[PDB]
Design an enzyme around this catalytic site. Sequence first.
Site, PDB file in Angstrom:
ATOM      1  N   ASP A   1       1.111   8.484  -8.625  1.00  8.72           N
ATOM      2  CA  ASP A   1       0.406   7.997  -7.452  1.00  8.72           C
ATOM      3  C   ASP A   1       0.180   6.493  -7.555  1.00  8.72           C
ATOM      4  OD1 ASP A   1      -0.636   8.363  -4.951  1.00  8.72           O
ATOM      5  OD2 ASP A   1      -2.452   9.409  -5.594  1.00  8.72           O
TER       6      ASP A   1
ATOM      7  N   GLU B   1       1.362   0.189  -5.543  1.00  8.69           N
ATOM      8  CA  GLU B   1       1.737  -0.715  -4.462  1.00  8.69           C
ATOM      9  C   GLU B   1       0.790  -1.890  -4.279  1.00  8.69           C
ATOM     10  OE1 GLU B   1       0.959   2.754  -4.048  1.00  8.69           O
ATOM     11  OE2 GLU B   1       0.533   3.018  -1.911  1.00  8.69           O
TER      12      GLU B   1
ATOM     13  N   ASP C   1      -1.556  10.166   2.640  1.00 10.99           N
ATOM     14  CA  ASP C   1      -2.798  10.665   3.219  1.00 10.99           C
ATOM     15  C   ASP C   1      -2.611  10.807   4.726  1.00 10.99           C
ATOM     16  OD1 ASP C   1      -3.643  10.301   0.605  1.00 10.99           O
ATOM     17  OD2 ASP C   1      -4.621   8.385   1.044  1.00 10.99           O
TER      18      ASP C   1
END
Lengths: 771, 771, 252
Positions: free
Chosen positions: B416, B419, B482
Amino acid sequence: MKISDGNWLIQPGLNLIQPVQVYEVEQQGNEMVVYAAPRDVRERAWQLDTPLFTLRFFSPQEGIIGVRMEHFQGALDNSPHYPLNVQKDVHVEIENTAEFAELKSGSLSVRVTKGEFWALDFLRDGVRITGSQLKNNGYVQDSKTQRNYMFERLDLGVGETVYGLGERFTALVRNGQTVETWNEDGGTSTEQSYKNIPFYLTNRGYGVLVNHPQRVSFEVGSEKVSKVQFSVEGEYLEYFVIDGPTPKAVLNRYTQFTGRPALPPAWSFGLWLTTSFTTNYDEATVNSFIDGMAERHLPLHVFHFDCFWMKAFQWCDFEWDPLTFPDPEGMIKRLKAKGLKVCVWINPYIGQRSPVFKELKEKGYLLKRPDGSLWQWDKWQPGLAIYDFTNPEACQWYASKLKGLVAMGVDCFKTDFGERIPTDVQWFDGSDPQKMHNHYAFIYNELVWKVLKETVGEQEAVLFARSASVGAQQFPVHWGGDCYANYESMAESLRGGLSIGMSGFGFWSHDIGGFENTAPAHVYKRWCAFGLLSSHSRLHGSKSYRVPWAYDEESCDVVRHFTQLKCRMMPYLYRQAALANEFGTPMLRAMMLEFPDDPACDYLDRQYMLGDSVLVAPVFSEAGEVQFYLPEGRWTHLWHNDELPGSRWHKQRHDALSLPVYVRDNTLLALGNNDQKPDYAWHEGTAFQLFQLGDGNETVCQVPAADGSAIFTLKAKRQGNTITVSGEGEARGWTLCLRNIPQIAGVEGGTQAGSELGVVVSAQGNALTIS
Amino acid sequence: MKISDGNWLIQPGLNLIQPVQVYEVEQQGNEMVVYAAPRDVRERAWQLDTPLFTLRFFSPQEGIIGVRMEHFQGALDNSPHYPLNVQKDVHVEIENTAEFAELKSGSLSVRVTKGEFWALDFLRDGVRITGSQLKNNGYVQDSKTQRNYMFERLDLGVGETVYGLGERFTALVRNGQTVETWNEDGGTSTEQSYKNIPFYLTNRGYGVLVNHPQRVSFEVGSEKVSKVQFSVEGEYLEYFVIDGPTPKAVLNRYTQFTGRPALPPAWSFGLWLTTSFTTNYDEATVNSFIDGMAERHLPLHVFHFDCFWMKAFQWCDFEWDPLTFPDPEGMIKRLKAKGLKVCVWINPYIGQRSPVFKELKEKGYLLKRPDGSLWQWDKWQPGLAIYDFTNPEACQWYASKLKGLVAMGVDCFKTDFGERIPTDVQWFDGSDPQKMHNHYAFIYNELVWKVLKETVGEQEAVLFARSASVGAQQFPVHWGGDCYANYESMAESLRGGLSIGMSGFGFWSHDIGGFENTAPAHVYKRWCAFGLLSSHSRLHGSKSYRVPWAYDEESCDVVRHFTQLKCRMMPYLYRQAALANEFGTPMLRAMMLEFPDDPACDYLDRQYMLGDSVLVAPVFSEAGEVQFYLPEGRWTHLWHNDELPGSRWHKQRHDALSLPVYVRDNTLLALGNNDQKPDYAWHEGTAFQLFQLGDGNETVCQVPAADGSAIFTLKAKRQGNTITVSGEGEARGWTLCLRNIPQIAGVEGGTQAGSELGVVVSAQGNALTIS
Amino acid sequence: MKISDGNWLIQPGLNLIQPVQVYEVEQQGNEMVVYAAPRDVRERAWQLDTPLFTLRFFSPQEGIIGVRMEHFQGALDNSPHYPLNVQKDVHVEIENTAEFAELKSGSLSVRVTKGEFWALDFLRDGVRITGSQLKNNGYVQDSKTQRNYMFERLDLGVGETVYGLGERFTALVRNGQTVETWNEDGGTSTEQSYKNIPFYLTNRGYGVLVNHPQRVSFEVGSEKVSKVQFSVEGEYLEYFVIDGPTPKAVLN
């Protein structure tokens, strides 16, 4: 201008104050007021030291709901304002219960939910279509520029498509575009638009308008993709929502609210020719052009003089150049005696190099810089100056000059430019420069239209404008602008025309053959075919004459054929124009507007629908190959008589003399016997055309008069194998051509004959029956 | 960033230097060099005191042409660079005549015209498809910021549509979007994208790639609507053009150039369940969830542990929390003995609150601010720090920890974040921060994949990543991110998945039922149906458990039905995955990719195509009403057996247990006899399904093996009223079900029987004939 | 204040607009008007989107020629003005042929050549004594200060010597001095002068006066050594030239 830096954080130095809860609701006559706070205020401790947003809901017209959100009422609201027609005799209903507040007008309603959850919804008969969710109606304070902004977001469902927002040459669907409303002269290739009007429409039948002449920032499909955002500088945000089962009803309501489009004269619906811009032309050149056009059996109705009819570096001075047109009156009289019309070019900008500049400066009719000076820059003309139309004396002088020009023999005017208005200036009336930047074009057009109606009359009033704003539809004649000689330019011009048609304007025009550069040949033929099938056809060029014989004989032949076809189709076009004037529906309808319930036409922009029955798919390929989609129903070509099943795509190759033009089923078209003039007796010797009259169906057709009111109506009813036609009104002799019918087995009162297109029955009465 | 302020003028303070003429051409081995000047240089007087652009044309691979435009060669070019595979044994042709310069590779060529007119064209077998016109390849100097930019514009014809540009949740068509390539964690609703890769594709069969890891500014449909603009800061601009008759060939070439996607293991193609993010879970909770899932006859294959498997404010520390999982080894062993898989969550960010932070700082394995300090901010974890993967020692430590975790019993990892990398930092290797901002995700994924392949093996290697860059396809498993619990969120996620599929990634996944907020019920069922028909299905939540029985029994029933259907359809999905690995074609194909020649599918985004034969149109309405378009051919439902004509739209209402899934005509699908596990013997007891075998047509089907290579092939040929089927390979017992065939009038070697779906013939050999 | 950074380039952030060609000539009573453009305008395509300098030539007195160069006429011209005696009963001659435009007063004349070559000359009985060459009558826009300047250069022959410019305690010959007209109380040793009057004289018998009470920047023998430059802030530049066989007649 960016507000949200993603979905969890925001840009630095941007204070956000958003409503979170509803505090109080009040009813003031026919209006509702909601006072809201950004935090819980149910307890007495927090009922202080906090802001309070005020939302006013009202109904200026049936089916339209206006919302005004305010933070500070101490700000100044100066002139001007959009010319909105407001009725104070509208029946409205208000329901204020302990759970929610509802304001219902007509079939539309607005619902606000009280309690901890803040939500705003718009209901069409009790079903939500859109609204505002929590923390989406914020107010932004920017410390860097010490500025304030008000932004509003409206939800979008699945399949929503946004259209309108003025003349845009980008993709027809506005999803994913950060459009901004600010008039600018940046050509047609660039995203900048000559005419900008804040208003958008959705396929679901609801439209949104923003009442803010100043700059408005729009975000469709941008950050917050599932919502449409619009933001404006200041302290108050006002916007209106219009309902309607179909987009046509929304357009009707909008046109009723902002002003119905006028009806152009019949003679205006014809071929227009100009003397180009940079070319060297004089009286002899015009005479030779007219003689050559007449010799080649090419009808001409309107002639235009470009900017260079005045002296160089002198525009606008309203005096003919002695060295080029020694006797303008004689030339105009000769042209009028030949059956043509004369109509000229004007602009609201004047040049320093002019004898009248000193007198105008002395009289103080020009725009003034804030302190004591004038506003000038190195642009279109040296020492450019802008007429101050806010001063009545300047308007009177302009009107007197225009009256003199009209008395000279002129018919219309071409109001070019009117978008590069500065903002750091002080107007005579003291109005806000930001709003005047957009209202100047409307003021100029209104003044010109008033002069024209005072001199000639309402019926013969017509114009040719490049800039527009809200309410300009009352003088509808528009021109795309400067385009290039390419297929892509043609596609972009078609997209812009469709967009402006969907934005409330009912008439549009474009330069045939391109403005810049010289067209090779084939593209010129395709552009001529496309333009001659539109409301208005113009031949204007920048460096080369736009005359068909300058390229080859095939161009002349196709131009003659298409002009004859348009003249033969005049009554139907005039009836469609009358319908556009009445209900506000544009003549150059998009595919979606006619069939909003068909998902296949959502993303169609290379083909268009003329009237309520004609479909045209102009070609954009050298080889002539073209693909077009037909909705449900059987379609027949206008002059080829072939049949094609509907509700599917089709591919076809056509030569320069043919292109895909089709008519839906169950149609009763009307045509005239004159193919040289558009101002002939439409109700004399008319030919109705019957296309695919199915069993049990009824069709009607109303031929209009000079004033636009129907003069004769014909109704056809089919039962089994017998068709009965009944007509009432005023007419003397007519024919009915049933298409794709080789022969009939019986007639009653009509003389029947055969033809390559079917069976033609000449009627000696006003009632016939055919078995 | 704006360059042109319309079409006639430009923004102040922007010096533009553009090539206008070709001065010299040279041939260096297999490359072409063009030296051009902004003004006429034919005369000796002007051959000085002017700039000179250098354009290098080369062919790194067959069918791909690379162009490098340079102004100054004295600038620095630091690491890193995109991992591009370049072959030095490519046959190329160069033609340098006095009129033009041509560089031809394969079927593609690049032509430059000499003389006064400068023009660049790309020709596919001698016909232009695109190129650069005059004064469209400029170089910009900005005095305000003292910066330099290089921009390039490529022409667009009529009907051009742009796709790709990474994971974007905006409209599928990129026309009218000012996309920018910069990785950012801004959710899914916002235009910001977790993974950005500069590359776009066009429906005409040509694609464009930009070799610039740094920020790239893209303008599609913006200013200069008829052209696509891309600009980058610096002094050199490099870009590649890939040809191909169809988009599939372009994708194949791109995947060959940048890296072929890997083949995920068979067991990875199953249902995944997680313990949510904020929910309180422990060993007992996991055991109870597994027991409840088993009791309700709901198969489960993969289990996931979310971030909170570590200690709070400790991530990432790679130590189990003693208070929640006292014996991780025993729990993992028990889960593995039950037939499930264990796989965990990791991220490249560490928190200040951790005992190992001091040791890591002492060892200098963390990112360092330029002077002497560390980089930290108030974000996801307090005192956040970023591992410095450029240091080999830190990578070795991370690999050792991952190896220990794998030895504990873990299978995959969920990489996860990755970025939000800063730019004002000094890396250990001294690489440019701007390019590292995008290359960090690729480096992290490569390290994790290398560790996984070293520990377990290539066949069992699999991951779950949220960030990606160029070349990440070599480890293809991706998750949208999300999302919210709404129909609009589902549509946006589908759009993003289609876009990422068209951008070179062959596998994609999304959170079923939404991440934020709790789904009411119906939307949850629709989302489950949609996700379970995709490559991978995940059940992850933020605040509530994503378990079907938490809502109602109908959700459990539909989940069971869809999981059984997916298990029964495993061999076809695995064959499609093998095809994706070989030729690079994504499994979740868009409508356009399968039928690029059909204009009706250009603007379709609510329905998708699974494999090369299945079409799925998930519903987005409460009432179940849905409209979908079918291309030419007869389509039959997967389990309803109804027939619908093709090449048209259709509307249907379906309940929660049904949705529009169809199979094209002339199809030979394959299914297995096991509906509980996806890792069964596909070639044992298989059931082929015959759909609409037309006369004179031939069909083939290849069932894959564990490694993905075909193990058995079956060919069916129809002539008149006789169908002959021949199979070769490895198999033991199989059946062939002809659909919509009530009975047959003769069989040869096969035992025939009837069924509600048609006629099932069990084969005792490898060749049959049915009359 | 510097305009040219040598002979090939100019200082950054200084937009220069200079007349290059003569577009039109008109006769208004006893005055001549010349409208000029910075580029070729013989073709109809370039007769737009360009500036236009206006030069007015008149003769307020016998033997004196006044030149007024203007760009924008919308600016404000407030009081005061120099007390100049102007006579409206002066006999003047104008010759407007297809080759050149000549304005003759007394023994002096001003000649402007039409066509591609722009040139201005002052003739004392048909022989040039001075004038303005090509690209020497420019208008400067400074973006840094958002200011505007008008400068003019006059040619100098061999042996020319410049005198005057008020009470200056520097060398008698003004060649090589960047004098500026601005009254200041800085003593006598310093270059500053108590009394400043913009006017200079030459040994050849011709004198130049600048009608601008505001600050005037003078450059004699500075950059462009072979020319005398005078520049002023604003939008219009007015200057007078007085002839005479000897300096005494010029002073008279």
